[PDB]
């Protein structure tokens, strides 16, 4: 009952085809989940004071060659040509963000500059390694890059760490393992630069009261990182989050700002993603909930249904009210037994089934059944609407009484 | 002047650069506009009963050969390869939508099925023909495909036409010219199918009293199209909308549903895009308004400012209250003359400037000035918040009077 590929078919969320290896066809209901996840991340972007931008899908290979990634990663990049020029389909958003940073003179007053994007990335991953939503060729990162001074690093990493635990707690993930990857054998910068950079990550973690462990020698050539691994309800580990310091890319791409002493300074860059791949995170969630998505995420939140034809216009009014309240609602007005309707929508993991018999219509009430088979009895319509709105707005993991 | 390139730079909306010809980098404020336009389109998708999906970025050339796309467009497609297979970066969303349609058995009871996407598309346009946001290589099409029966064509084409005029009138575009583009020299489908399709589109225009001219030979290879051209305040013509009737691609991609009888039948497909390209439409709006976007589209909707440090706390509170009412708002507490502050936000095209002096703090009021220079008086805070909320939620073209 926790295979995201079977559940994804059963709930009509997505499909894959050999015509587009590792690129997801999002169906209506799956795209609803994705969009709702995007809304959630955007709420955190506002709360943590990020800009949100959007970069193009391709950029001249010439620019990618300047980044220092081209040699290590050419074989995993899609390329395409036009008019004697070769373009890379972007595998990451960082160089694009630096291009945005480079427009307009920046000063120290603009820092820290926090730049997020739901970045549509492609990697030419071997087809034999592809698997459902979790190993794909086309993915979307909840990405951001922070441009800051050396003095601002700790405070910026501190905020990233808070954002990580904040976001994972929303989905019920409270068991998190954290690993700090230290200086590799081949690296840029001085040993003193590495001492200070590793300490900044370590102290920011201490300032959040987070125990962690080292992954010795596993840092990037361009700086140390923290990785965050969450545990699902089956105690399976999923590495999702990354906070990566980068002392190389800004210099490579001629990024600079006017310092307070009026000299040209090169900013430090922090790369961070919390969920990682949105597609992969939806896979993880599907398995974690076994398809019983929390109401805020559920493609269809409520189905309103009549026992007989006599309650059809009451169901229509109630459905319009729920629609006006911002709820994802459908009316099931089929000439079918109420038990048939409940079973179908239970199998589809609809959080709430609002049942209207003659007694409900006559009292201006509605009978509420949950997808877990709980009869909550019959309740005043406006009180039920208010409770559903609260469960949705608060992104609650739990259903009503 | 109302050059979208200049306004785009001045208001920090977007940029373009030679490393990515005809591809847009949206900066924070431009991306806010884009996303509000998406919110608007999604409101119409809901109103007109469309699903929303997302297709893959690329698909195997083999599939594009089956549609007729390879024969009809290879020199304008970007291609890439992996593991000895060639992929086309999608120039259109229709084949992907049919792939989604083909998952799971469809019956007549599922039709009309209206499937929309903000489709990321790419066309390898000659670089010399590119200009601004109006002719680009990478774009986002407000696309949809309607799968319906032959009997449903008249109602579904009518609804598309209604949707076009509805959406254009939101932006104040009332001068619309219409052409019916008929069978091109290179095409698919029989002359009897083209007779039927062309006649269906002609009747729809006649029934709506839409005058039109035939545009001979300019149909799509798969079917005829109604083309909608809007006129801006300079009386320039911009072709934006298209409604196309297709009796050929569904058969080529093995689309079918079980009819009201029990026989296997091929659905009709209607293609339509209204804004055309999100990027181009933003370009057109930018010029139409000269950067004075209606409040609902404006990157920053309200700026709240003090006279002295005396009113700082009141201003921060009012700002929080506008933020709670859903308004894009910032506070300006700087130690600058009120005329300097007001000018700055007028230059940035902020719709409303809210000013708090001692008399305003005392009375629970706020002084409101519009970016055109009208002083609306000191007014009760909650009456202003309510009036702004209505202006925004109703997507009004005019500010308060
Ligand atoms: C958080 C982001 O802002 C950051 N840029 C990132 O992707 O970090 C997560 C992992 C990075 C490691 N990685 C993994 N796979 C790759 C595949 C390709 Br192709 C290229 Cl060019 C680079 C890489 C690459 O750095
Ligand atoms: Zn990055
Ligand atoms: Zn189409």
PDB file of N, CA, C and O and ligand atoms in Angstrom, chain A residues 94 143 145 271, ligand 2:
ATOM      1  N   UNK A  94      21.815  28.006 -10.744  1.00  0.00           N
ATOM      2  CA  UNK A  94      22.738  28.955 -10.103  1.00  0.00           C
ATOM      3  C   UNK A  94      23.290  29.984 -11.113  1.00  0.00           C
ATOM      4  O   UNK A  94      23.269  31.179 -10.836  1.00  0.00           O
ATOM      5  N   UNK A 143      14.586  25.764  -5.349  1.00  0.00           N
ATOM      6  CA  UNK A 143      15.956  26.264  -5.294  1.00  0.00           C
ATOM      7  C   UNK A 143      15.984  27.722  -4.854  1.00  0.00           C
ATOM      8  O   UNK A 143      14.998  28.463  -5.018  1.00  0.00           O
ATOM      9  N   UNK A 145      19.345  30.943  -4.245  1.00  0.00           N
ATOM     10  CA  UNK A 145      20.719  31.336  -4.008  1.00  0.00           C
ATOM     11  C   UNK A 145      20.723  32.629  -3.226  1.00  0.00           C
ATOM     12  O   UNK A 145      19.959  33.547  -3.523  1.00  0.00           O
ATOM     13  N   UNK A 271      23.914  28.157  -1.870  1.00  0.00           N
ATOM     14  CA  UNK A 271      22.901  27.412  -2.623  1.00  0.00           C
ATOM     15  C   UNK A 271      22.066  26.702  -1.569  1.00  0.00           C
ATOM     16  O   UNK A 271      22.636  26.128  -0.633  1.00  0.00           O
TER      17      UNK A 271
HETATM   18 ZN1  LIG C   2      22.849  26.238  -6.969  1.00  0.00          ZN
END
